[PDB]
Amino acid sequence: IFSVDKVRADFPVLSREVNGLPLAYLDSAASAQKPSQVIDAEAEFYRHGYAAVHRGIHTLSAQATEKMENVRKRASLFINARSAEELVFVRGTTEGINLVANSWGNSNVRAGDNIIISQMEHHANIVPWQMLCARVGAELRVIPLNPDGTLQLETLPTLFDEKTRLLAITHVSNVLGTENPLAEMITLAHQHGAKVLVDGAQAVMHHPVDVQALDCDFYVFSGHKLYGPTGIGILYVKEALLQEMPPWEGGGSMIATVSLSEGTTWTKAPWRFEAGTPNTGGIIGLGAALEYVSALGLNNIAEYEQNLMHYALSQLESVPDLTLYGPQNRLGVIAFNLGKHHAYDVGSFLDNYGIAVRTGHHCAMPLMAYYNVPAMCRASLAMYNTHEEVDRLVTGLQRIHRLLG
Amino acid sequence: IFSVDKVRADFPVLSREVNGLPLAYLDSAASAQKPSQVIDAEAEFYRHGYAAVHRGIHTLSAQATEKMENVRKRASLFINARSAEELVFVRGTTEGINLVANSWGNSNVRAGDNIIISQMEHHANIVPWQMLCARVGAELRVIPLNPDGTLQLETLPTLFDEKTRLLAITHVSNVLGTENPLAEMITLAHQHGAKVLVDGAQAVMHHPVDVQALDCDFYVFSGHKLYGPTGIGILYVKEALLQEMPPWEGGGSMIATVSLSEGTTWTKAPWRFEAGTPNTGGIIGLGAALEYVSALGLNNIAEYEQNLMHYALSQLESVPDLTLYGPQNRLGVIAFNLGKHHAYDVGSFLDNYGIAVRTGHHCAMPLMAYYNVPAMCRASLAMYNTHEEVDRLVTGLQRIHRLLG
Ligand SMILES: *Cc1c(COP(=O)(O)O)cnc(C)c1O
């Protein structure tokens, strides 16, 4: 059982004041605050054990290399991959998706083929596929939305066919909070021989994730949303697919031999996908974030967060003219619009009260278009957020509506 | 005028002990140690002002965005670019070169064209061009080396022709320490209409760099060698070329509009080349590293380093059977082999004495092949290194040779 006061004491930013008022940070879905255990693990590495990591012979380099490969193993256990060698360190979810789109996509998606995404996807899980489709002459097909923010799954029979090579789908929507029924969609996709890439950027901080039970071919997530540093993320790929993938970036460490007259040969997976000095400091920090979350327990986090969400949804019913977008069982985020006020103005007033929410299209323009709105406000209710911050959001929306209505 | 004792007091790792002995870190060319000003600037950002940066409406996000764009401006002044908008944040030199090779390369290098590199290049400035040449049917031409580690510039007339699209060349060799005559090579290249990419990963920490005086089209460097955090680097591109470059990675923030029926449009340079959440923590750290180096003064650093180098080369003359590779006016690094002992063994003994050097091919296999050796040892003599550490290296090589000879 969870203690929000003890969790909050680990996060130095939560004591901050903004505009002379106490900060209510409701924007973790854009990027999470980081516990002092994470900030200090990276700082301590730089202050005491820093070195280059390419299996250097000297002591510091050999120890830094082992720290990096231990984080690879820890991340692999966190998502229940079968092996540490199925995980590639990238800059974040976006880079992971681009790596798959070029390395797997360029060799497996041909002219006349199709790829399926959904209308709720974030731009990170849209744009790389649009680019691939334009390079190879393939078609980007779209699973449409229902008004409650769930996918229209009855349309799958018209979208999947013998030319469908890939399903790229979000685990959890960054706007709606919808959790998609991945295991069943993946079963469907595999019956056609299609691979499945899952965008898990908003899933990994809310409940346990198991890629062997999901049976996904590719899974991606970013460290900075998982209470860790920026500049680091994970791409998981089934071993059999990753072993056939050609390299994306070229340079040092991803090669086996380099010759200017006989050409270059590549090293084995995962190292073939990691060119140049890695973000070692970010990798040490991510390892600490995974330990921090695992010590609190994801089932404990999920229980507290669901209870906070239930409290917020119940309190938000007393805000006049509030429109909510997404299903009632939403995870993590609440997307809303207040009466006819533009989201930018509502978010500006909320910021003037010390409450940080995100406003705009949330990198999901197609999703905004589906709802016929230019933008939305979004409150994130993470594990370190409280009932009191929910009460300040409800009061603030009531005040805004009184003032501007 | 420089004070090495005061500079060393800012670097927490330099007090460390390794194998029960005092650390002599002579591997800065692989990755540099970081001053507490740099480590703390990043930690302080995470502890007090952390937020997502995509011009968010709330206060923390708006301030984080401004911190990031101020670092872009500071980096642009450090290399004397004309504008902050000519600089793109990447993971490091390697990613920068891959970005240019795909985005500029794919649209400007065609079947039957050629690209020129040199035989001293690091793999980061070789492999992306080999990959581009294989994608488009172009030829990779090579400027050969002279025994003293300098380029055979008399071969340029046979390598440059009407089909030469690009010269990709190192500013300063990571093994030899040779500084190439960039301004004159760039004049030559531009007479043929060829563009020039400069690999400045080993130049920016040793003396002032001026891209307007060099007139290079592309310039790249990494933060971790410049006393800053890992996971962050800079790609500089002349405005007129960058403005015509299409995007490489796709996703959030690099778009202007995203549509699933009308396609996607891109934002302007530099932001079109930066997809997804940036490495904000690394960018804050890099800004602090640039301030730290500029406050010591690069001409002061260069004077101390050149004097230390002159002392080392003079002391190394008393090591029996030492072979040195590179010119006498080398910068930063000393590449060597001891008698007939394999470099791995020499480096292992040096590590047993607490002295960290790099051994192996240094991501420059063609350079090792040129000298007909499998590997070399390399000592780096950076601004925080001392005469005493040089004396320990000389004694250690003398002891190793006595013991194994
Ligand atoms: C280290 C180095 C590179 C690669 O830098 P990364 O930071 O590993 O991407 C490229 N060129 C030279 C000359 C180098 O020394």
Ligand SMILES: *Cc1c(COP(=O)(O)O)cnc(C)c1O
């Ligand atoms: C934030 C997010 C992304 C992009 O992550 P980056 O860390 O910015 O690369 C992709 N998908 C979803 C669902 C997200 O929430």
